[PDB]
């Protein structure tokens, strides 16, 4: 929508994910404008509490970027994802965590 840029979303672990070993689940949102944005981390279909985020910054094209993160432990059974809401989106967007992405 013009001066409004939809965010790119990357969900991933800080360290190579090994089942049972504590780690950090990340959701990196970039390329978006305006800065008002909502990012949730999801576990097995429910919101994760205690999700922190970096300080709002922007790139050369003035589009903003943020890192959302919280501690987590990858397992065999647990499904993790990010859900991002923005003015550019008609629905909240869900991006599931791919272990090798």
């Amino acid at each position, epitope marked *: 929508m013009g001066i409004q840029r939809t965010p790119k979303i990357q969900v991933y672990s800080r360290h190579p994910a090994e089942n049972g070993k504590s780690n950090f689940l990340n959701c990196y949102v970039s390329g978006f404008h305006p800065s008002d944005i909502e990012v949730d981390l999801l576990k097995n279909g429910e919101r994760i509490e205690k999700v922190e985020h970096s300080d709002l910054s922007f790139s050369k094209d003035w589009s903003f970027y943020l890192l959302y993160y919280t501690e987590f432990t990858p397992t065999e059974k647990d499904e993790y994802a990010c859900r991002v809401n923005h003015v550019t989106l008609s*629905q909240p967007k869900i991006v599931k965590w791919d272990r090798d992405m």
Partner: nanobody, 116 residues
Framework: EVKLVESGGGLVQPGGSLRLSCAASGSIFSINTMGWYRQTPGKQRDLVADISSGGSTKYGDSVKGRFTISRDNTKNTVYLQMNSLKPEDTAVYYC??????????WGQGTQVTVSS
């Protein structure tokens, strides 16, 4: 297939109250979080309230203290008690659900109009 059936939308005076309801069909244990977003034309849909199968609840800032969400897992139904409705609560209210694999589902939405 999971379907989200909503009811309760309509017209209400400012300061009044309305009770929305949403039942999940086609599944009895597939859906974890169920809740409500609201949307006016042209903008994003904002979280109103949602609640997991374990009772973990979250409210949007603009409805905290006035709205109460509740849930009956045995028939997969959520309830939205909307108290002290202002004209700014006028929007389409979408029920939604999350599977335990983070698959989202959405209802058709109910229009809620607060006007004197």
């Amino acid at each position: 297939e999971v379907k989200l059936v909503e009811s309760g939308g309509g017209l209400v005076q400012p300061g009044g109250s309305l009770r929305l309801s949403c039942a999940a069909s086609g599944s009895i244990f597939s859906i974890n979080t169920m809740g409500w977003y609201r949307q006016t034309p042209g903008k994003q849909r904002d979280l109103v309230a949602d609640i997991s199968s374990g009772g973990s609840t979250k409210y949007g800032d603009s409805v905290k203290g006035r709205f109460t969400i509740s849930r009956d897992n045995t028939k997969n139904t959520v309830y939205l008690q909307m108290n002290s409705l202002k004209p700014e609560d006028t929007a389409v209210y979408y029920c939604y659900g999350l599977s335990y694999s983070n698959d989202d589902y959405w209802g058709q939405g109910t229009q809620v109009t607060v006007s004197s």
